[model samples]
Target: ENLYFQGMKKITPKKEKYVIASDSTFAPFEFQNAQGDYVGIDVDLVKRAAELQGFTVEFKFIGFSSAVQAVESGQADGMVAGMTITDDRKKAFDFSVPYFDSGIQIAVKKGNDKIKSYDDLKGKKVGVKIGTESADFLEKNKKKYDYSIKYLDTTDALYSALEIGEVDAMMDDYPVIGYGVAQNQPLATPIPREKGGSYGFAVKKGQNPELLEMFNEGLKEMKRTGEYDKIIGTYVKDG
Candidate 1:
């Protein structure tokens, strides 16, 4: 694998520098590190792909909504902030092949044995980030599960509320919760995860064709050389 990647490293470098925008707070995908540097799976994958494809990228740690506008208005060459490839989004953005398969799941404070499944959520307050698929899922099943919903704006708030007993449980992307647990956050998943959308890198419709090509080609190389697994394992453990 090493030899394979190295052999492809000599490909002609594109003398172009492209700007990419991403979400400011989507952890395990895009977020700040201890030193306040933007770091996460999305950041690493794009950076590594640029290196492999011999291109250059400048990242903007803007929020997801802003990133979407930035790409549409040509303020950025592309965006890769764990943006799910949805039918509605495809109308405005051309996306690379799906890079990550994401799913939603419920998380509870560590060592909490009271809630074991959705059925146990009856009469309990279930937390979720507003406007996410998880929030929609919980809302859809609210009557069936008989749980009250607490909508937070971010995962940090959801985690905080869960840890401090403000909410009995939280729903978020499985990998997001898994990454948090792997990083020592006092969180656990006691129920099975549900299917969610796949994540993809995006460029404005009919724009930056070469940049998109490089991202796709580089991703193929990353998978072939085991770099993709290494990157994912760095942030999440088997769950």
Candidate 2:
């Protein structure tokens, strides 16, 4: 498999220049707004971290699977999608310290509250974004859940399916569903997991230790100064 170090070799490494890839559909983490500009908690957080660390990032908007492939294939320096740090992904890439903690959740119609938990999803149709860890997790537990999953091209589509009764509910990160509800997706209500997942920046395995270290340091500084909460609160309120 393509690794992080292979991608690092292509970087000239002058003045902290790096290319970062992310999906344009992972809401609250990364997504395009109505004006078509990419904006989200992750986007702002990464930009702030880069500024503090004196790095220039070339942000590339792409599919989640493609973003991962780009980082692995040396096409990008790293990815900052709201990607959960999973065991399978760790086999192919190196990750920074956890930046956010979120649980997996199901969003269902406001009044149709039959499905109160993950266990209630049995035999029900569920929607999820294609190429996301949620999809992978559902796939891995399909037998245990006794249900089939429907993959949507994007989070919007997944939410649409849930709203239109095309699917029983949508599976995604908790913060995203929270953002959607705050945005007035009236049909949705979150069913949060007891324990959430952690997200981090991912690089090709064994590459860019310096850049990774710089990011970690900047992240710590941002957290220390309360800038992190300010940025996240802005999006959560506005989204």
Candidate 3:
């Protein structure tokens, strides 16, 4: 899950909005709560942005890669999944101003000292979420590190594998990894702050100009009013 997602109109029956899509298990960013509802920083951020601008939005419960595909394929309008604003992605999509600063890191189990660096990971198995920048970084260096790769559909699975030693090490967004160590208070970050990127809301290129405008403008107010931190704090305060 990557959607790490919105908001408003008094339109009769509430005008159905562009189907914004995201994840089911990227905790603190996007995920389903025990209450069976979607909730996270992205969810509240998108919602607040729309409300401030007087528009309506509906979210699609799609996983990470699928969410991006939905926007590109025209199956959905836009998305706020934990999408990074890479130069490549910029060519195909128009992204809103960054809402979150992120980077990736590698982790090993608590008290596990056998693997202390990338060199220690030689021939070891590393876990990563499918289609993420973390995966890309791993693939780029797997040969150099002499490690095998394992892919998961969600963070819950990826982190669980690392927690239980299913993988020798796991890589994910720094914030995601930060929250995990914060939650457990003992996991080790063997590799830190690799490839920084900003997470943003996105739409197919040349598409959804108004929506983008609203996000940028509304996001500005959110920061100015401190609502942005307020929403993100709910998740990371514990981490």
Candidate 4:
């Protein structure tokens, strides 16, 4: 006789799958290599975070603005392209933990060791975003200190010459340089906000804050368990 021994059924949990968008050519942060393969801080972090959270993710490489628009329009689950975890981004997107810390990307021209402090800036002109306190400060004392000034339109034009050592150095939005994009140039920041513009993964505030939730949990784990370093170490060696 076939006895019906009814007990309990074992259940299995299936991990969620997600498609994430990122900056297409933002080198070092998210961009292609010589082999047509993608590599960078953002790419590594997203892959690692998803793994830790038991979620699978696919990456789409569009430009920065497009990637953001994709998330805003629900075309993607999330993005990570060295986006700053600024206090101001919350209106549009929810961010994960401060995965990467950043501030002023004070890119100095290579091989000028004497360039240590603002005192060194006495004879050299520096670039500052026009609307910043730094600009006000530059305006105030720049001429007094025997340095000249040449203001540029945007960060792109600014960093372009700065990247090639046309001027002595410049202050750029930290995350822009941190992302490895900056035309894939080897620029570095020497200042600190002491606490500004930490990079974070994000999704639109309402559409899929769950992705942000997952990222936070995973980031906490990565930080606690040291996975965070492993990923970042594979790409960047902090400037």
The residue pairs that clash in candidate 2, if any, are 4-204, 4-205, 103-196
Q: Give candidates' CA RMSD values in order.
A: 3.5, 6.6, 5.8, 8.7
Score each candidate by Cα lDDT: 0.86, 0.79, 0.82, 0.66
Which ranges of candidate 4 are over 4 A from the true structure?
A: 1-17, 108-195
TM-score for candidate 1, residues paired by index: 0.82
Best by lDDT: 1
How do the predictions measure up, each by TM-score?
0.82, 0.85, 0.89, 0.62
Cα lDDT for residue 43, candidate 2: 86
lDDT of 4 by residue, 66-89 (tens): 777888888888888667665556
Residue pairs with colliding backbones in model 3 are 3-81, 4-29, 4-42, 5-42, 5-43, 6-46, 6-47
* lDDT winner between candidates 1 and 2: 1
- What overall lDDT, based on C-alpha atoms, would model 2 receive against the true structure? 0.79
| Per-structure clash totals for the candidates | 0, 3, 7, 2
- lDDT digits (tens) for residues 7-118 of candidate 2: 2222133545688999867788888778998888878877877776567887998878889999999889889988888788889888889988987777888888688777
Candidate 1 clashing pairs?
A: none
| Of candidates 4 and 2, the better by lDDT | 2
- Backbone clash tally for model 4? 2
lDDT tens per residue, model 1, 177-198: 8788877899989999997799
